[PDB]
């Protein structure tokens, strides 16, 4: 599994290059793993992945929540890995053929898929939650090794960990701004994802150091 | 929206030169192009403005937005700043996520299209069982534009029933995935067609043939 420094992944959702680079640079002593999503990529281009690599030498997880038909999923993954992403986040809700298409590209290109089962926001309770245990089981059956589950629902995060087993790698968003607690989340997740609590702080380095101290 | 010839081109070529050439070849037959992540992630969001400049077509951004409300609002902002007229959003992440997109679209004078049931086989596993409820959620939220599957005309018909004749419905899965253009247009206002046109020997003839059948 990826060795995430301090078990802390930065969700870099700032939307301009200058701020995103500044904040990431400020927290680089604490965090070697950066999640980059569409807010930054649609604002600055896929070449932002290259810039981050060049500047920081941090692993990059492309949080693209890939959720299309198998053929389009393959293309999205190929474009994403071409750009230098280490891993990509894929939705499970569209079903097994869609997830398999992503896994096939990742195997071909020597990269990793993270399967998003249950989401962290309240609306996830409407449709996703009821499918999430089966999505997770589908992942295990497909040979998925890396998973994403919600900090905001510790009981659900615990069930996801049970389903995937201790050997699988589990990362969890919803810590801080959405209400999840870092220590409680780390009972089940290998690493926590944190965005606004760090990138909106007056001193992102101090914010990162504080979270890390609180999980020692 | 008034889609010329009820035909929307799904421009999923991944190289700017091919995408512009092929779109140029079929421009006399369309006025609406769906641009997705294959082209955007390969060539940049500036491709949208380029399509507007070259073709003056309407642009639907097929981004199947599927994040938390806060991230959804950022995605929609970036997308509309790039010049998209509309964005496709998944309904399965629930009402708050959809609402976030609706809010941004209202601010910038654009439209949200709600994707309920998808066209590929895997849609049967989780999406299909939720699709009617997702459509009723769209109705509650005041969504006027929807996407449903050409490959399952009874499911497309049901979607039309739920949303009513006044809502706008577009449908992918025509051609390559097995959906029929004429049957799909019994229920949808417009069909989305990708590979059957853009992978054709003669894309212009492919489009003209389709339009001849409908
Ligand atoms: N991928 C995600 C799946 C999810 O269920 N929840 C979630 O917040 N995310 C993402 O994680 C990050 C959470 O950031 P924050 O709430 O710490 O700011 C954002 O990039 C979200 O888009
Ligand atoms: N947005 C979609 C929802 C969907 O359910 N099926 C689908 O194919 N799409 C998209 O429509 C287009 C279908 O293209 P083709 O099958 O005609 O090549 C592709 O861009 C897909 O990503």
Which CATH architecture best describes the domain A1-216?
Alpha-Beta Barrel (3.20)
Distance B172 CA to ligand 2 centre (A): 5
Protein residues whose CB sits closer than 6 Å to any atom of ligand 1: A 11, 13, 37, 63, 89, 116, 119-120, 148, 150, 173-174, 176-178, 193-197; B 67-68, 71
Instruction: State the structure-solving technique.
Output: X-ray
> CA of B157: how far to CAs of A123, B90, B142, B147, in Å?
27, 19, 20, 12
Distance A32 CA to ligand 1 centre (A): 18
Number of neighbours of residue A30 by Cβ within 10 angstroms:
18
What's the reported resolution, in angstroms, to a tenth? 1.5
Is A130:A158 a contact under the CB 8 Å cutoff? no
- Residue A104 CB-half CA count within 13 A: 13
Q: What distance in Å separates the CA atoms of residue A83 and residue A49, rounded to the nearest whole number?
A: 7
Q: What distance in Å separates the CA atoms of residue B123 and residue B133, rounded to the nearest whole number?
A: 15
Give me B139's structure tokens: 């109705």
**Does A39 sit within 8 Å of B94, measured CB to CB?**
no
Q: What distance in Å separates the CA atoms of residue A3 and residue A120, rounded to the nearest whole number?
A: 24
**Does A37 sit within 8 Å of B93, measured CB to CB?**
no
Q: What is the 3-state secondary structure (H, E, C) of chain A?
A: CCCCHHHEEEEECCCCHHHHHHHHHHCCCCCCEEEEEHHHHHHHCCHHHHHHHHHHCCEEEEEEEECCCHHHHHHHHHHHHHCCCCEEEEECCCCHHHHHHHHHHHHHHCCEEEEECCCCCHHHHCCHHHHHHHHHHHHHHHCCCEEECCCCCHHHHHHHHHHHCCCCEEEECCECCCCECHHHHCCCCCEEEECHHHHCCCCHHHHHHHHHHHCC
A42 lines ligand 2 (CB under 6 A): no
Phi/psi of residue B132, each to 5°? -65, -40
Q: What distance in Å separates the CA atoms of residue A15 and residue B87, rounded to the nearest whole number?
A: 19
Burial degree of A130 (CB within 10 A; 0-12, 13-18, 19+): middle
List the alpha helices (DSSP H) in B8-68: 16-26, 37-43, 46-55
Q: What distance in Å separates the CA atoms of residue B203 and residue B137, rounded to the nearest whole number?
A: 38
Could you state, in order of their start, the residue ranges of all structural domains in chain B? 1-214
The CATH superfamily assigned to B1-214 is Aldolase class I (3.20.20.70)
Q: What distance in Å separates the CA atoms of residue B169 and residue B147, rounded to the nearest whole number?
A: 6
CA proximity to B211, closest of B2, B6, B3, B1: B6
Name the residue facing A127 among B67, B121, B130 (closest C-beta). Answer: B130
């Amino acid at each position: 599994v990826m060795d995430v420094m301090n078990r802390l992944i930065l969700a870099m959702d700032l939307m301009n290059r200058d701020d995103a680079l500044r904040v990431t640079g400020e927290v680089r002593e604490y965090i070697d793993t950066v999640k980059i999503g569409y807010p930054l990529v649609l604002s600055e281009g896929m070449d932002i992945i290259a810039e981050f690599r060049k500047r920081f030498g941090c692993r990059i997880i492309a949080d693209f929540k890939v959720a299309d038909i198998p053929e389009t999923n393959e293309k999205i993954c190929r474009a994403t890995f071409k750009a230098g992403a280490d891993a990509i986040i894929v939705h499970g809700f569209p079903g097994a053929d869609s997830v398999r298409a992503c896994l096939n590209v990742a195997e071909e290109m020597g990269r990793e898929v993270f399967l998003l089962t249950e989401m962290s926001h309240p609306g996830a309770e409407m449709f996703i939650q009821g499918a999430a245990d089966e999505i997770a089981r589908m992942g295990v059956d497909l040979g998925v090794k890396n998973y994403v589950g919600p900090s905001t629902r510790p009981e659900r995060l615990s069930r996801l960990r049970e389903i995937i087993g201790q050997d699988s790698f589990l990362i969890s968003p919803g810590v801080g701004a959405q209400g999840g607690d870092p220590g409680e989340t780390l009972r089940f997740a290998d690493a926590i994802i944190v965005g606004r609590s760090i990138y909106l702080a007056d001193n992102p380095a101090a914010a990162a150091a504080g979270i890390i101290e609180s999980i020692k």
